[PDB]
């Protein structure tokens, strides 16, 4: 019996277990300490106890462990991990462990981790002598990612539009910039659901920081893969720490010959959070941002990479535009040109209720020749030579009302080719 299953159950199951097990008053406190108490009396009863979660190392040599669906929050649900366990299984931050928990001694509260039955989804003995990060190296994106499913739906139309606007490959470095109310939420929604449906093999990660809790919870119930989302209720320290642990566990996952794609919202928010958390270096630029507060987001954004021997790490991230804050532009043109490809959206396109509000002319990609074949290569060079002359929004309505009558994209290619 692990903590994961009763955590995943709603509050009603916890309550009913409470009356069934002697906890008559479980409707007063928070979820974490309530499950803490129920696990306490479980350990009193001697029922088998199991643990699952990711372990990290704090300033001291001792290590803590945290769960997945707990929104990656450290609290009473953490699990002890001694430095000896770290040494003898070469453990590090960002590793997931499925190991039986242990009834704590008197005076200690967390359930200590007896030993690891598996390390990062694989056996501990292979993890003891396992590939390190030095061999994991950044390659250009080669394998095209498909986001088209085919149902004659607006989300499918947006997916096809973004497919024809710019190719998305495995292990690439993509960024999105858009004004407010330009359609960010549903675009990230359809790209996430499309990469989940078309590619069940690759794990799906969606990152949300300082977002409204409602958008957080409606991303919780929508995406099939696990989603991390720390709303603005938590302080900036929680957001930043979630950021490094999630990016580093994604790095550990891609270290295991596994394709990982992480959706980031938003790079500007984490930039401001890093500026808040980092000490002042005495060299402040325009907008109240000092030099050392830009390197960490730069390292985070540059972590996107593909691997030659196997695996890919695709960071697809969104950035804010013209929100009235000058440091937003400071980081906008401080991050400019640092990605593999970019997606621009505009205000006036979304004002006319034309969706998606992507800018075909402004959006582009570098090194399309390697990711695609010659036939499709010329098949979108014809696209942008046809579309570039006339207006942007005019081309938007042209493509939305001409692509809609075609079920697929290839058939669209031939139907417009004869024209």
């Amino acid at each position: 019996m692990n903590l994961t299953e009763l955590k995943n159950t709603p509050v009603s199951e916890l309550i009913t277990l409470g009356e069934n097990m002697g906890l008559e008053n479980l409707a007063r406190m928070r979820k974490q300490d309530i499950i803490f108490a129920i696990l306490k009396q479980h350990a009193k009863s001697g029922e088998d106890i199991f643990g699952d979660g990711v372990l990290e190392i704090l300033q001291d040599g001792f290590g803590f462990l945290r769960s997945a669906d707990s929104s990656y929050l450290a609290g009473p649900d953490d699990i002890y991990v001694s430095p000896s366990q770290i040494r003898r299984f070469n453990l590090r931050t960002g590793d997931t462990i499925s190991g039986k928990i242990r009834p704590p001694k008197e005076g200690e509260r967390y359930f200590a981790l007896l030993k690891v039955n598996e390390v990062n989804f694989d056996k501990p003995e292979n993890a003891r002598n396992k590939i390190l990060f030095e061999n994991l190296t950044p390659l250009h994106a080669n394998s095209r990612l498909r986001m088209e499913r085919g149902n004659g739906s607006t989300e499918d139309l947006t997916a096809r539009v973004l497919d024809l606007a710019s190719p998305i490959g495995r292990g690439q470095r993509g960024l999105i910039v858009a004004p407010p109310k330009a359609g960010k939420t549903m675009l990230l929604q359809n790209i996430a659901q499309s990469i989940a449906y078309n590619h069940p093999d690759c794990v799906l990660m969606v990152l949300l920081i300082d977002e409204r809790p409602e958008e957080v919870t409606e991303m919780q119930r929508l995406v099939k893969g696990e989603v991390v989302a720390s709303t603005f209720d938590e302080p900036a320290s929680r957001h930043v720490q979630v950021a490094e642990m999630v990016i580093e566990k994604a790095k550990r996952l891609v270290e295991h010959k596994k394709d990982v794609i992480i959706l980031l919202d938003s790079i500007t928010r984490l930039a401001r959070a890093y500026n808040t958390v980092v000490p002042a270096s005495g060299k402040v630029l325009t907008g109240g941002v000092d030099a050392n507060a830009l390197h960490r987001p730069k390292r985070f954004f540059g972590a996107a990479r593909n691997v030659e021997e196997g695996g890919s790490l695709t960071i697809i991230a969104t950035a804010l535009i013209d929100t009235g804050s000058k440091m937003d532009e400071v980081i906008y043109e401080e991050f400019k040109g640092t990605g593999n490809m970019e997606l621009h959206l505009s205000r006036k396109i979304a004002e006319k209720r034309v969706f998606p509000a992507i800018d075909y002319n402004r959006s582009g990609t570098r090194k399309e020749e390697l990711l695609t074949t010659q036939e499709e290569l010329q098949k979108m060079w014809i696209l942008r030579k046809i579309i570039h002359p006339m207006g942007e929004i005019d081309a938007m309505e042209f493509l939305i009302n001409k692509l809609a009558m075609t079920k697929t994209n290839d058939d669209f290619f031939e139907m417009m080719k004869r024209s």
Partner: protein, 187 residues
């Protein structure tokens, strides 16, 4: 036949590394011949440096993969020997080491860990006490000559090449260098 095919693959990549080392030795001998001679042009010297650098990186990684292959074949042979030896004579070990076996069998996880630890240190003191005499022991009957040829200790020219590491960005530098190198012998 998993052990046999694993050893065959180990021999295959070992021979590949040997051929790579022959190409290396050729590269350095022509390098020394050109530098000792009238090497007026330096563009040839620059490209020779390119091939020498990619060559040392390639032999480093080939020696490393050979070391991992040798370790893997040794480990799988040890596991197979453990499996058939337990299938032959597990009952005597069960009789001699019963208490921790009952601890690991019909008890909870923590008692299982305690049994693991006590069986561990008991067997370790057994091995460190019984090896004092240190009488010479032969390899497995079915796999004697194969393991004598491959050897427990591989070539000395393997450990010195395997210890040479490079930056992951520098690793992509070597990868692109090898890509254009392959294009070089393509023409």
């Amino acid at each position: 036949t998993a052990l046999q095919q694993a050893f065959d693959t180990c021999q295959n990549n070992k021979a590949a590394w040997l051929q790579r080392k022959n190409e290396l030795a050729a590269a350095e001998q022509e390098y020394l011949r050109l530098l000792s001679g009238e090497g007026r042009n330096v563009s040839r010297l620059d490209e020779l440096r390119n091939i020498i650098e990619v060559r040392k990186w390639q032999v480093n990684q080939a020696a490393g993969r050979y070391i991992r292959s040798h370790e893997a074949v040794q480990h799988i042979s040890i596991r197979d020997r453990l499996n058939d030896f337990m299938q032959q004579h597990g009952t005597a070990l069960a009789a001699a080491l019963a208490p921790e076996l009952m601890g690991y069998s019909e008890l909870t996880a923590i008692a299982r860990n305690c049994a693991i630890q006590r069986a561990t240190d008991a067997l370790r003191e057994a091995l460190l006490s019984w090896l004092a005499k240190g009488e010479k022991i032969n390899y497995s009957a079915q796999d004697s000559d194969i393991l004598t040829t491959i050897g427990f200790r591989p070539d000395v020219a393997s450990v010195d090449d395997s210890r040479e590491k490079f930056t992951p960005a520098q690793n992509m530098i070597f990868s692109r260098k090898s890509a254009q190198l392959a294009s070089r012998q393509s023409v």
